[PDB]
Design a protein around this motif. Sequence first.
Motif, mmCIF file in Angstrom:
data_model
loop_
_atom_site.group_PDB
_atom_site.id
_atom_site.type_symbol
_atom_site.label_atom_id
_atom_site.label_comp_id
_atom_site.label_asym_id
_atom_site.label_seq_id
_atom_site.Cartn_x
_atom_site.Cartn_y
_atom_site.Cartn_z
ATOM 1 N N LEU A 141 76.337 8.997 41.591
ATOM 2 C CA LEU A 141 76.131 8.304 40.319
ATOM 3 C C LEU A 141 76.100 9.422 39.274
ATOM 4 N N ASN A 142 77.252 9.657 38.650
ATOM 5 C CA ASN A 142 77.418 10.732 37.681
ATOM 6 C C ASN A 142 77.305 10.430 36.192
ATOM 7 N N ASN A 143 76.791 11.430 35.479
ATOM 8 C CA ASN A 143 76.654 11.432 34.032
ATOM 9 C C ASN A 143 76.069 10.201 33.388
ATOM 10 N N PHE A 144 74.786 9.973 33.627
ATOM 11 C CA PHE A 144 74.110 8.844 33.025
ATOM 12 C C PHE A 144 72.917 9.362 32.246
ATOM 13 N N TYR A 145 72.399 8.500 31.376
ATOM 14 C CA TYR A 145 71.230 8.785 30.553
ATOM 15 C C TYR A 145 70.672 7.425 30.110
ATOM 16 N N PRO A 146 69.335 7.217 30.179
ATOM 17 C CA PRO A 146 68.215 8.067 30.623
ATOM 18 C C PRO A 146 68.236 8.338 32.132
ATOM 19 N N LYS A 147 67.405 9.270 32.582
ATOM 20 C CA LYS A 147 67.328 9.616 34.001
ATOM 21 C C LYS A 147 66.796 8.491 34.886
ATOM 22 N N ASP A 148 66.061 7.538 34.304
ATOM 23 C CA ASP A 148 65.482 6.416 35.060
ATOM 24 C C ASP A 148 66.558 5.553 35.716
ATOM 25 N N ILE A 149 66.604 5.561 37.039
ATOM 26 C CA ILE A 149 67.596 4.773 37.755
ATOM 27 C C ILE A 149 67.058 4.427 39.134
ATOM 28 N N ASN A 150 67.411 3.248 39.625
ATOM 29 C CA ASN A 150 66.963 2.804 40.939
ATOM 30 C C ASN A 150 68.188 2.442 41.777
ATOM 31 N N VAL A 151 68.403 3.132 42.895
ATOM 32 C CA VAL A 151 69.534 2.803 43.763
ATOM 33 C C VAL A 151 69.062 2.159 45.063
ATOM 34 N N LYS A 152 69.783 1.141 45.503
ATOM 35 C CA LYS A 152 69.466 0.454 46.740
ATOM 36 C C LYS A 152 70.716 0.353 47.569
ATOM 37 N N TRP A 153 70.566 0.443 48.884
ATOM 38 C CA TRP A 153 71.706 0.305 49.769
ATOM 39 C C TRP A 153 71.622 -1.071 50.406
ATOM 40 N N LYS A 154 72.760 -1.746 50.493
ATOM 41 C CA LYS A 154 72.813 -3.061 51.117
ATOM 42 C C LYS A 154 73.938 -3.044 52.125
ATOM 43 N N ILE A 155 73.627 -3.444 53.354
ATOM 44 C CA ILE A 155 74.618 -3.504 54.423
ATOM 45 C C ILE A 155 74.786 -4.985 54.774
ATOM 46 N N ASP A 156 75.975 -5.525 54.541
ATOM 47 C CA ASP A 156 76.244 -6.927 54.816
ATOM 48 C C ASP A 156 75.256 -7.880 54.160
ATOM 49 N N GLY A 157 74.866 -7.576 52.929
ATOM 50 C CA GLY A 157 73.943 -8.450 52.234
ATOM 51 C C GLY A 157 72.450 -8.186 52.327
ATOM 52 N N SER A 158 71.992 -7.345 53.245
ATOM 53 C CA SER A 158 70.549 -7.087 53.289
ATOM 54 C C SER A 158 70.254 -5.626 53.000
ATOM 55 N N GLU A 159 69.151 -5.394 52.301
ATOM 56 C CA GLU A 159 68.736 -4.057 51.916
ATOM 57 C C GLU A 159 68.386 -3.177 53.113
ATOM 58 N N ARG A 160 68.855 -1.936 53.071
ATOM 59 C CA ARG A 160 68.608 -0.939 54.112
ATOM 60 C C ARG A 160 67.796 0.186 53.455
ATOM 61 N N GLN A 161 66.524 0.299 53.823
ATOM 62 C CA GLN A 161 65.649 1.315 53.244
ATOM 63 C C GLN A 161 65.509 2.586 54.058
ATOM 64 N N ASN A 162 65.773 2.503 55.355
ATOM 65 C CA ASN A 162 65.646 3.667 56.221
ATOM 66 C C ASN A 162 66.934 4.461 56.378
ATOM 67 N N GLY A 163 66.792 5.788 56.349
ATOM 68 C CA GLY A 163 67.919 6.696 56.492
ATOM 69 C C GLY A 163 68.568 7.063 55.172
ATOM 70 N N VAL A 164 67.867 6.840 54.068
ATOM 71 C CA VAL A 164 68.392 7.152 52.745
ATOM 72 C C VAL A 164 67.820 8.486 52.251
ATOM 73 N N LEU A 165 68.682 9.301 51.664
ATOM 74 C CA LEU A 165 68.319 10.620 51.189
ATOM 75 C C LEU A 165 68.902 10.747 49.778
ATOM 76 N N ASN A 166 68.040 10.813 48.763
ATOM 77 C CA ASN A 166 68.454 10.952 47.354
ATOM 78 C C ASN A 166 68.153 12.334 46.770
ATOM 79 N N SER A 167 68.949 12.746 45.787
ATOM 80 C CA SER A 167 68.761 14.032 45.114
ATOM 81 C C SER A 167 69.293 13.908 43.675
ATOM 82 N N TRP A 168 68.581 14.470 42.691
ATOM 83 C CA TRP A 168 69.001 14.426 41.272
ATOM 84 C C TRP A 168 69.228 15.843 40.765
ATOM 85 N N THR A 169 70.153 15.999 39.823
ATOM 86 C CA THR A 169 70.401 17.305 39.219
ATOM 87 C C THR A 169 69.466 17.344 38.013
#
Lengths: 219, 222
Positions: A141-169
């Motif tokens: 997710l490149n070049n956005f402003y403000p820094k406040d952002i929420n990302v969620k992963w969905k596999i076949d319609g349901s949210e997947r919370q485990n195994g996610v690794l996020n990093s911000w510049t």
Amino acid sequence: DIVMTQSPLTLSVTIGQPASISCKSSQSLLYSNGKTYLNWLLQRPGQSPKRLIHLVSKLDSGVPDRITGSGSGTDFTLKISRVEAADLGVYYCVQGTHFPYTFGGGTKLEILRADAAPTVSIFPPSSEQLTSGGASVVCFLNNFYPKDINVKWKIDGSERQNGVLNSWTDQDSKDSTYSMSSTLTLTKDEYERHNSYTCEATHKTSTSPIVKSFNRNEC
Amino acid sequence: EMQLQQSGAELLRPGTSVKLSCKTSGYIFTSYWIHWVKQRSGQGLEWIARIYPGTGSTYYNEKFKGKATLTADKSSSTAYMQLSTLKSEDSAVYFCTRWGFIPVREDYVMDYWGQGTLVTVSSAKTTAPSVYPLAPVCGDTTGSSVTLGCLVKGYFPEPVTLTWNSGSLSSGVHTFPAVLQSDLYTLSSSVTVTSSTWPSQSITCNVAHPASSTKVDKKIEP
Ligand SMILES: C[C@@H](NC(=O)CCCP(=O)(O)Oc1ccc([N+](=O)[O-])cc1)C(=O)O
Ligand SMILES: [Zn+2]
Ligand SMILES: [Zn+2]
Ligand SMILES: [Zn+2]
Ligand SMILES: [Zn+2]
Ligand SMILES: [Zn+2]
Ligand SMILES: [Zn+2]
Ligand SMILES: [Zn+2]
């Protein structure tokens, strides 16, 4: 030890506007020789700290006079008359009047710019990785402003919370925007058992979630 | 041109010790105090000690007596800081600096700083990274410009060096800070170019991990 308190913790200012940071000490910083040893340092992203001011108000060589310092006793202020992009970083007040020398907790100055929508790119696992039995789906997710952002992963319609690794510049000194990477890691087996992989983001620039996805199949 | 060069990142086992170096040049080493500063998890600075190389005179912050020992070799213009019996709190970035305060003038001369030395205290094993190319499929961003990526995962310890096309390609590059999980770090980088450049001309991801002597080049093929 002297406790040094800085406020605010962070300040968001637009280019061309003034900014001021406060620093309070638990003891007076007036040394017995009549001098006040209060310094201000600036640590730019990925650089070592640098002294901007010494003796409360004296500017070090090569420091722009848009920067000024004032105060006495237990209260000090650093002011920037007109903010420029180069002012991005963390400001610290540090006293040398009492031993040992102590630092304030820092104040992060960030450049307030216009809202910018993220440019999203999603990437399925590489053959290389699948061969080893692992599968990571990457979302940038490149070049956005403000820094406040929420990302969620969905596999076949349901949210997947485990195994996610996020990093911000940190904030980019060229366009004042932020970037973020989100990686969902699964086993090769589970990856081949699902169909749709969706990277979903929530951000100020849109009333509805920002979507990027792909369907894995064959051919 | 006044310069201070510090030694590279260190991975230290709990209970052992390390000697950090700060090599200076461009000024009379013996005439100025050299200070050492500690930085933990981003913003959080602490003053350690100072030494006057000319005489070997040192002053320590109480918290660090016994933890840090400062020495200076006048013949090589190198200042040293030995940290003993390392533990959790000792993991940090350490800076040396020719601070510039001249006690007799009661005024300052310019401060010069080293680049900093990261010390990681852990007993986890050194692991070489696996580098994976990220070619678009939906991360194509349509036409006009396309973004590629590089996934570096499963390594220990930091740092890893990632460049694109050996450094030639620097604009439109975003390298994300490594994140630790289960004793291994993961890092990624994205590069945005125009539809005309790629696939036409090749884009390669160059990764280096000194701790394991791993050097790998991955070409982003369609
Ligand atoms: C009583 C006493 N104090 C002094 O002589 C004044 C030192 C002022 P200075 O700005 O050099 O302190 C600092 C502040 C900060 C840092 N620093 O951040 O490295 C170094 C030195 C003493 O040391 O005996
Ligand atoms: Zn005192
Ligand atoms: Zn006193
Ligand atoms: Zn299901
Ligand atoms: Zn189902
Ligand atoms: Zn499924
Ligand atoms: Zn299913
Ligand atoms: Zn001065």
